[PDB]
Symmetry: D2
Subunit: 448 residues, 4 copies
């Protein structure tokens, strides 16, 4: 059984700005919604903030050396909007942009392909005071922001992500309020989802106008499996699936919004002008999939708003985030996604990984995380299985390069293949990282 991956298959690791950078108000950088959110009592586990995080803003060179040691061929990262344009619109912050300039040059020097994401949940607070994702004008704002980077890194950054996980942004930020900006409203949720899609489309158009290379959106998908043969449970499954997995993909593929949403959001649902949908379906060059687990939803009449709830799959191992470990569902998702996009759209797993308990410090220079290693090997094999079934998969990015701030869950959830001691900023490569380095090095042959 060979597990050699196709020629040119790109191996890498991923991060996000607010989760690792720190130095949030340094060198002209503006205030973001997460600056506000994390400094409001009760919002974050243990009162954790992104003020320091992995201190990546200061230690990025060391982190690049770590990327070299892991044999990374790509590094997926996001750019902080508020660091580059403090008020979201208007004046550019020279120092802030200069950081990412140095970073990208350093990556290219090391032979690492820089994969940049425009928006990873950190909207400028100044734009939030103008309504944030509820204001349609954001489609323009985002575009302008996108342009600034497109021209600045022309020929250096060739592969672009627009939005990272619209569902997390809207469902967490506007529907239930567990994430910044912390709103709880179905009305706002539908409007926000629509404007996130529109902003993506606008950014793609602007990219056609001034940019060079390939651009696409990044979706998280959590495949919904049957709980039973009861029709109410199938209705539950379809509601959950529609709200989470089809909400954004369908209009991006020109299929409009899922019918089930009319039922999920009820009186909060809206009909939008057709030209919005033409803008939203603006053709992309590639698509990123963020994948971690599956769910098995059953009917739940009091669960707002999808009226569904996951059934705990006690037959399998679970991560520290409470996610079932089940690799075949990755293969299934990749096939499903290939079908939804017609096989015409190049795909990349832009995020995959797992959180398990690690001690806060290295133990004799080591971190032994056997379950993370297991997750890594089984899911990469599942990737190979997906390619064997004809899915056009071009690459794989491990979430995450570093133990970092897992947003509202703080530092308690470690996703890194590199351990970070948050007291000393000391980095220690985990057994999972060592293994991943070997997987890259053998181009998959180590799995045989």
């Amino acid at each position: 059984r060979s597990y050699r991956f196709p020629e040119g298959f790109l191996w890498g690791a991923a991060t996000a700005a607010y989760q690792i950078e720190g130095s949030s108000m340094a060198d002209g950088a503006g205030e973001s919604i997460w600056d506000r959110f994390s400094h409001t009592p009760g919002n974050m586990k243990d009162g954790d903030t992104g003020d320091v995080a992995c201190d990546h803003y200061n230690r990025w060179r060391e982190d690049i050396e770590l990327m070299k040691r892991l044999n990374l061929q790509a590094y997926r990262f996001s750019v902080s909007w508020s660091r580059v344009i403090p008020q979201g619109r208007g004046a550019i912050n020279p120092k802030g942009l200069a950081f990412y300039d140095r970073l990208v040059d350093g990556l290219l020097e090391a032979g690492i392909e820089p994969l940049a994401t425009l928006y990873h949940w950190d909207l400028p607070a100044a734009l939030d005071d103008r309504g944030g994702w509820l204001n349609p004008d954001i489609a323009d704002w985002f575009a302008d922001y996108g342009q600034v980077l497109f021209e600045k890194f022309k020929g250096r950054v060739k592969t672009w992500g627009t939005i990272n996980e619209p569902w997390c942004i809207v469902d967490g930020g506007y529907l239930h309020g567990a994430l910044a900006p912390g709103h709880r409203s179905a009305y706002e949720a539908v409007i926000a989802g629509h404007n996130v899609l529109r902003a993506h489309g606008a950014a793609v158009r602007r990219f056609r106008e001034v940019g060079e290379g390939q651009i696409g959106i990044v979706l998280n998908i959590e495949p919904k499996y049957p709980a039973s043969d009861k029709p109410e449970d199938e209705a539950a499954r379809r509601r959950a699936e529609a709200q989470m997995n089809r909400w954004f993909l369908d209009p991006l593929m020109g299929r409009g919004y899922p019918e089930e949403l009319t039922d999920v959001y009820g009186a909060a649902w809206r009909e939008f002008p057709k030209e919005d949908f033409e803008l939203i379906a603006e053709p992309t060059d590639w698509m990123g999939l963020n994948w971690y687990t599956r769910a098995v939803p059953e009917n739940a009449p009091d669960a707002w708003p999808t009226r569904s709830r996951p059934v705990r799959q006690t037959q399998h191992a679970h991560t520290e985030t409470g996610w079932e470990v089940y690799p075949p569902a990755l293969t299934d998702t990749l096939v499903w996604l290939s079908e939804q996009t017609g096989g015409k759209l190049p795909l990349m797993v832009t995020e995959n990984g797992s959180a398990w308990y690690d001690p806060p410090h290295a133990i004799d220079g080591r971190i032994h995380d056997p379950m993370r290693v297991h997750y890594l090997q089984t899911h990469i094999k599942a990737l190979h299985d997906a390619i064997g079934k004809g899915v056009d998969l071009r690459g794989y990015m491990v979430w995450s390069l570093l133990d970092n701030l897992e947003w509202s869950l703080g530092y308690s959830k470690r996703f890194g293949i590199v351990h970070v001691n948050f007291a000393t900023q000391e980095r220690t490569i985990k057994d999972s990282g060592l293994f991943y380095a070997e997987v890259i090095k053998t181009h998959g042959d180590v799995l045989n």
Copy 2:
């Protein structure tokens, strides 16, 4: 004796979303409360303002009720989104026509219309543009004000701009118990500033295109000492600054309270010099909303004022949990008279109490002796305040009707007229009958 000054104006007060119903009828736009009340968990028993008192349909009956109560003034608010569905742009003819009919009808009955521009029901379309976090609202509001100023020129002579900035910001942006349901000190500071600016802009617009008298309406809750411990006094001043001085001081041209720098910490901001010039734009009158006092003590974990009220078990409490203590009204009025230098005519735009009443009348009656008591003792307290030199021009009872007490739903009844929400049947309570006699005798019944 308790006879009141000549020309002293007696009335009752309401607000649009709390009584109107028909929130989406006849072109009416969606407001932030339409959204808020239809989100599960926000409202007690899942109550909404969809029907309320059905006043949009029964306003004539309600006016006849005003006549039975001998009212000389009626304080009400205009729903911004009913008049301007998108907050800016096209006027909604029927929505404006409702208030046209209402005001004309009031004038026919000899009742003075006291109009409030904003009573917490922001158009949702403006909320999607940031609401009170967007400085442009100062202009938006002004334009809205103009529409009314010109429409009711010569008919509505007494105007309120904003009703209770503190409730709007503290409830709506700081703690999130009210629409639009945000919870942020940063947003609270910005929103408070833009509320004050909006008031100023509306007053300027009124100077250019309006006719009559214009002013803001503040709620004040006097903070009394819990002890002689210094940390408790510091607590008292934090609470007082955050609730009672936050808006009054910049309105009187004295800037923001120093204590706010301590209350909001990193969320506090410095604002441009000209903003305070706009905010202190001279007004003609001021409204006071008053219900109770508080006795704050130090509470380090209470965010963000680090203070909390001490339950005053020696006195009666309302169904909203507010201490019954009329002397604090007198004091407050005096205090207010002093903060505004005595030059600014004051009016009690809201005062009243919530007690349990049955959901239906009992042989054509509702017996509410505690509400009657609250009424008589606090009106006497008004007389005492006038005796100490306060230029107090009138008194409006909250409320004319049992209505939607926002997030607390219909469970909190403030009306001097009972509303059976099953049948929309109105029954005048004993408090209403008594209030009618207080008006007719111009206070002599209190002797």
Copy 3:
């Protein structure tokens, strides 16, 4: 007319721990409520019965208030631990002397003393031996009963054994909202059984050494249909069985309700037959405590009866959240008459309502029109019940005094006499003033 039958006895009721105070005074022992009320979280506002109405010291004043109210009867309870500090053994002379003086004072006033042996205040020493879970309590109780039976032989002629077995067991052992604060269906079943046995043993002992009439006091909350749906009728029957028939049926020699097997499942037990012979020991009268009705519907997650009341929003509710609905009193009396075969003399030993009153009088008055309304409508309902052939001999208002409403503390005022708990000053409410007229006119005032 609303004139009541000849000899119809009007009175008012209290309980020891709710009014007395002086819980550890003059040799008095520790009760389960002494412990319970001084455990944080158990009582609203941290209220205790340490002082209450200070009745232990102000009983003479309270008797003068009874005369002013024209009371013909005063129903009160005797604190077991005040009379027998350890529950068994040595008698406390001063403690017993209190009730001696009280009873003599009542007789001096021309007031019928109505004594209750047990009103929820078990001696802590007996609770340490298992309390109502220990079958030997049937004997302990009997012995305690004997002490009183002999002491007031010829003075107290009408005796209550247990006040509301359902509240004792459901509140004290099933859900833990009342002392001793256990939460167990197993314990609930056993405790209910032993409470019934204790009642029987006490009645037998009364036959051996006592004089007059003896009976139990049950509270009943009639369960009305929420719908004609069979699941709701089954729910109604479960609730009715657990609350209204659990104790009445074995007392009438009918055994335990079948539905209990379904309600309690694995916690249900079969008991020896002679136990049921003991439980059905013939009594002379029965007390009904009545306040409201319920309208139960099916509720699969409601433990353990799988039912829940539907809020009857068309009617007024008290501050304890109880629907005001007088016809249900009439129905209940009829029902009870039918269950007891018409052969057992009935008395309403508790009826009343809680509404907000200020903490102090207002120029010498307390105006409680809703309590007055409750009083007049429910007394009229009694007349209706007598008109339907129910053998009703009397009516006791709960309560004579504002007192400690157990776990709900002093916030719930049931008194027709207001108590300022800051000053212990008594002020007769409008309800008391009206009730005095009801007694005086023997019901004729309800006409005019």
Copy 4:
């Protein structure tokens, strides 16, 4: 070097309700955990001990597992309700026959049986008589003890009376998180006293009819300073007194800690002198159950010790939220040696850690590196304690099997042998393998 003293006994520990299952099978009576676990809300995920590890049926397999681990001792508890169904009266032949078979099987395997009389599973019939609140239990327990003492005379030579009085009382009577689920300080004080008395009575009875060595087993959680704040030191001493000195002190003839008067307030009681004579009956050995330390700070609303632990984020924490800090073991042992005058032979009857393991093996393996780390560091800490003169005779790993962690259910795995609760399949973890090597080399594997 880490070679241990000659005769140092290596073993592993379990408890009856946590592993046996078949709780009311073969004549066995109902225990308080039978009731408690089958009452909704009491147990995580609704887990019960109905099946557990099915040890009642699979004990032979488990003994083969003990042999593969090179165990020299197996510490287990006897279910009171399995042996005497009503707690008093008739013996249950089958229930006793199980432990007879078990003990013979262990002796046959060359494994020293260490028996515990009470590990939290009081017979329900005795709970209906007041349980640990009824002083008569001192006698009941004694009788129960006698039954075992005589049945296993010459076979079971090392006896434990009570396992962790503090958990029994604090969990079962003070806070109500454990069976019998009471929450009362009054009851907590009484129950603690009667547990101590029961221990004494059992020791006396053992002197009359038993053979071998008898002792109690205490859990100790050493309390370290959170700060130099005096309120925090007072907090530390309250917590220390309530948890670590409550039982040890009267066992050593020093009476109850003074601080308890402050902790329990009005619930505290004075007891007869002869009670303390009974409680201090001389024992032959003492068991220490040890897992972690705590760092308490002042907490006025924390009932009743008014203290709370400060999270030590510089160190690793187990899945039960317990800090991993091996030196505190060494210190504790020394402290215990000092409190007992160095004259009383000590044994660590429980030490171990809970980390996440998958519910099934991979592949026929369970890799638990943190449990291995915990094991090596704490065993080294034992060696350090022995080097300082502590008379430590043995070490028992908690636990032999993944089992029911009481109210936290099966989610907390303490086993050095993994149990697949779907299939009852046992798989020796890396920790078990390593421990087997530690026993074999008598410590030399550590170096």
